[PDB]
A paper describes a structure:
We demonstrate that the pentameric ligand-gated serotonin 5-HT3A receptor (5-HT3AR) can assemble to tetrameric forms and report the structures of the tetramers in plasma membranes of cell-derived microvesicles and in membrane memetics using cryo-electron microscopy and tomography. We purified the full-length murine 5-HT3AR in a saposin lipoprotein-stabilized lipid bilayer and performed single particle cryo-EM, as we previously reported. Further classification of the tetrameric particles, without the application of symmetry, resulted in two structures: a near-C2-symmetric (which we will refer to as symmetric) and an asymmetric tetramer.
The distance between the extracellular domains for the other chain pairs B/C and A/D was too wide to form an LBP. In tetramers, the displacement of the C-loop and of the interacting residues were minimal for the LBPs of the asymmetric tetramer and LBP1 of the symmetric tetramer. The serotonin poses were significantly different compared to fully functional pentamers (H and EV1G). In contrast, the ΔiG for LBP1 of the asymmetric tetramer and both LBPs of the symmetric tetramer suggested less efficient binding (G and EV1F–H). No significant conformational changes in the transmembrane domains of the tetrameric forms were observed upon ligand binding. Significant differences between the symmetric and asymmetric tetramer 5-HT-bound forms were identified primarily within the extracellular domain. The transmembrane domain exhibits a consistently stable arrangement across both serotonin-bound tetrameric forms.
Author numbering:
A (entry chain A): 8 to 199, 207 to 275, 278 to 333, 422 to 462
B (entry chain B): 11 to 82, 85 to 106, 112 to 310, 315 to 333, 421 to 462
C (entry chain C): 11 to 28, 32 to 33, 39 to 68, 71 to 96, 100 to 154, 158 to 160, 164 to 200, 207 to 333, ...
D (entry chain D): 12 to 23, 26 to 82, 84 to 309, 314 to 331, 421 to 462
């Protein structure tokens, strides 16, 4: 009389007992098969040490009660029932801090022989070890673990639905754009209490910061290099250097609010060095120009400085003596700046090597 | 007797069953989306935030009654009778009642603000044209269970912008739905409705803030040759130009969007013009330094002689070398500016014709 | 006696009973506001006051004031859009003779009409409304609501000048509350007005510079870059990506247009001066035009072209001074209209 | 424990114990974790707080004899809570939700919960970047007078003043002291209300700003000072001052974008940037005007008299002297402004450090 589907739903649910595990054989365990497909690394934070991701999470299992003969209920071999009305595995992430406002899937699929499936999108916010040095060419070994929250391995067992190799492959649903590129999802079974571990290794894309940090820094260093060719005994160089210092300060302000942060081998070369070298060069230029132009001859060049400078010139090689000492100091500063820029380029190439590519 | 009608509804239904008489007959979910606003299009994250007025309706076979028996449509509160499993397949981040009709039909309306995952290509910045999508699909049920169909005709939905709030940075061109059949097996086919929303960028602000200063900087840089002589007054001109350009590009790099694919096509010419300007400043400094106050190698003199021949006391030889190098630099400057103008015209033509 | 009283009043009163209210509102702080989305977000204290409970203290251990949970207990915004993350205060307050209280703060998210025309000297008039068929009233007289502003957090972007109520007729006897929030323009004294004034002054200085020199062209182009970066920067301060088009947004484009025109003039003139070869001389009609113009505001062909360029430059300078004076006059006018009212 | 909970809930919101005969009491402890963000524009201080409170109930009391051996966990929603709220509050924020409360067999209920408290506060930006801000968050009850619900401290005030170990101590702002102060709020409804005032003293780290704003500002000032070593006439300095001014404008736009924007007053340094702005513009105008003339004192009454009297405390003969005296006057003004900037910086740092 009643519709076949309605009668099936009644027969199954009105009797269904919310047992600890839906198994008639109470002693033996029941297997829960898991599968995780990554979709996007929405955000990664190094301050909060969290990793916001979107993963399509599907857990399979079989129930002893939710089985019926298709002979009755009009040859029906497939059914859908509300999630919370039945028992679902008590599987939780060992690491999650919060879960975002993912859509609420209310249905849990069932099959006539007792099989159950529960798909659900899952926007985790999990806390992991973030180590940002080698930026912008970073590689993160992020991972997360699934486990039975209260039950032990003797109650419910966790295993893959697909072979480990298939899970490891870079599945095609992922959004391969933007900062973070997914290398692999490497699963590992640890079986404490069943414990299933996925190793999500994500590699940053350095070209993302080609304009933000690479091009501006390279250009500022090159501009300072060409500026060093200007004579040191004129206000031309002073104006050039001070405007370049303003450029460096504006660059620092601009990146400080964008650069994910104290210390980073890219940023230990930028501003601890080039800003300090620029400031020292500007200070010495100001002092030399002021002293030479005032021409008061308040003091001659002291002997100790004379000997020290005539010794140091070998490394690179009365107002006129002051001009000469200023010039040789300027050449020494130019040599040091050349060394700094060479070290920067070497470091960038070395980092691009560890960030194996091409 | 609407309370009695509600009690009659509550007496039998349980939300776990598909409202259909024959389980073999798939439920048909009528769908329609109206684009209201495009809050943001984040190029770095590749997320198209947007606001959509989402409306759907499906038949409910068991929910039929005679209106006169209850004093003659009804609304039901939260914990509604049933709802399909339609999901926006590109969702990555984000009304409590439904309407019913006496003839066995249900209605649902929703203001839904989305954070959708899109494929953004910023090559043509600032004149971008995006082709973002929206894939509504049955997350769990198959084709045998739920089928999605457009409420309104595809022509009606393609051109419908009266609700769209034109104010913003982006412009709406279309919302073009097309039905597909996703198959994970011979059976178990899923029905998915794809609304390909197309949008453009409004380039006025970027034309006036990015393209105008860049074009004028290139033009005045070219002018640096003409009146300023080959030595002397040109050094300070180039110095000021370079110092202004450095800060301008610091800010531009702060402003231009970047993606894994790479920089916008326009962003290549800023770097080219910087290289040219730095080279010009260096060579002008060199000429000024040498002419005033070296071996002047003969092979270099022959090289420059061959170059000029193919283009179309020692200080004078230095001056001739400087003149030839300046002519070469002017030729390259003109070529670069012509290329920049041609690319701007091409990008604008593509953006407009779209 | 507390639990016995609770059970007694629970059994005595039903939710469905109203034969089948006084409101006091205090403003605390104004949250996000902007032209976009036309929403006013604020934090507000809402005190509510308005028989079955009516019980005698003597029969209940002389108890006089018993709190009750709000779960399934009956209690009495038109501009409503959202209520925000306000606390979920669960209890309610009752008195012995039936008097009931209910206090709870709200982070109201209400849609309102805002003008940006007078930005940043902007004074806005927004009103919240309270609104079963016909009654709602106020705890105090309308004039008393004004003094409540003294508790407002007044150091934010907006002042709160006055909160003034009114009564209407259930078309809930719609109660009106009119609140006047006056923008504080000293946020933008450094963000917006100071760079504008400085760029105008610097551009003024860069006009007595010789009109045929290289330094003139370098100065003008560097100022153009400065204007462009200023436009890029403040474009995030104002809600609109382009120029927001307040009355002051006009003067952010007039100056740039004049600077561009002056730059084009200067480059054209230097280009002509560089060409010492014979060239189209200044035709008689342009000579007459420039003669008439200069007469009303006050190496040969090259000299005449240079003079034409000079007079055109002085025309540009005159119009630019006029524009700057207009900008200053409008600024003082807006300050007067904002301060007076 | 299951049977204990069943019985406790079966025999069990309401006010716990005999208020008319004996007031109740709630104790609260505040642990400061991190100052996520302090907003100088909106005047809202965002902080992460670990909040603990306990109060003595009467219904949930039992003995180990009743159920085999002292502590139990019960759902948060079902049982009555002390109704404590922070008045200096704007938004809840995002923080973990805790489902279960703790209860001790003797009758003590313990509640732990961290909350991302977004508070409205009075920020004094005048001192920026050497900024010390006394920000207070207060706990009080409104539907319950002092008789209905008192409030007290979990531990001694000296401890909570000292306890800052859990603080991350990373970011822009430090944390100096979290010291409470109990006050009895008197209101018309009832002659006493109980409120717990917690004062939070934070402090900015000026290293980033010292090397981003102050260093280039001081260097621009000094470079301008040495600019006067160039001759007052001639175009060598005209190019110098032009380059300086063009750099200063682009620097200043970004600086203005950077500084905090409180209404009461812009930073005490923001005045000196404007002062040097004006001085540089005046110097540029002076040098351009001087070079314009030299390459004849028409109004001696205004021009000659002032220059003649100034030093007391044919273009070369007339104008060049005026140009030189103007240059020296402007140099003296520049020196005074730079000295004032230096003294203000030293004073601000002294105030910040002595805090
Ligand atoms: N989410 C698992 C089932 C499903 C529904 N729609 C899909 C689209 C693509 C895909 O790989 C899978 C699916
Ligand atoms: N009658 C309610 C008084 C009240 C509630 N919250 C408050 C906060 C502060 C204050 O002074 C007073 C109050």
């Amino acid at each position: 009389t009643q519709p076949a589907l309605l009668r099936l739903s009644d027969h199954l649910l009105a009797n269904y007992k919310k047992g600890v595990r839906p198994v008639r054989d109470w002693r033996k365990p029941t297997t829960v098969s898991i599968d995780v497909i990554m979709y996007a690394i929405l955000n990664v934070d190094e301050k909060n040490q969290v990793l916001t991701t979107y993963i399509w999470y599907r857990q399979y299992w079989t129930d002893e009660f939710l089985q019926w003969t298709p002979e009755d209920f009009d040859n029906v071999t497939k059914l859908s029932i509300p999630t919370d009305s039945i028992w679902v595995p008590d599987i939780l992430i060992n690491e999650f801090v919060d879960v975002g406002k993912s859509p609420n899937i209310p249905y849990v699929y069932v099959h006539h022989r007792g099989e159950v499936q529960n798909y659900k999108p899952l926007q985790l916010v999990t806390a992991c070890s973030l180590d940002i040095y080698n930026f912008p060419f970073d590689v993160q070994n992020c991972s997360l673990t699934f486990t039975s929250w209260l039950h032990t391995i003797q109650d419910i067992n966790i295993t893959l639905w697909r072979s480990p190799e298939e899970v490891r492959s870079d599945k095609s649903i992922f959004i391969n754009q933007g900062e973070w590129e997914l290398l692999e999802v490497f699963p590992q079974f640890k079986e404490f209490y069943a414990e299933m571990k996925f190793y999500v290794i994500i590699r940053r894309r350095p070209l993302f910061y080609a304009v933000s940090l690479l091009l501006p820094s390279i250009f500022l260093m090159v501009v300072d290099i060409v500026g060093f060719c200007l004579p040191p005994d004129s206000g031309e160089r002073v104006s050039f250097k001070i405007t370049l210092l303003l450029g460096y300060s504006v660059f620092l302000i601009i990146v400080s609010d964008t650069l994910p942060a104290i210390g980073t081998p890219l940023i230990g070369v930028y501003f601890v060095v080039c800003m300090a070298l620029l400031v020292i060069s500007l200070a010495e230029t100001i002092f030399i120009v002021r002293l030479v132009h005032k021409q008061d001859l308040q003091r001659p060049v002291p002997d100790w400085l004379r000997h020290l400078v005539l010794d140091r010139i070998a490394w690179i090689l009365v107002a006129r003596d002051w001009l000469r000492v200023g010039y040789v100091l300027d050449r020494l500063l130019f040599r040091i700046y050349l060394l700094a820029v060479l070290a920067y380029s070497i470091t960038l190439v070395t980092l691009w090597s560890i960030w194996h590519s091409s």
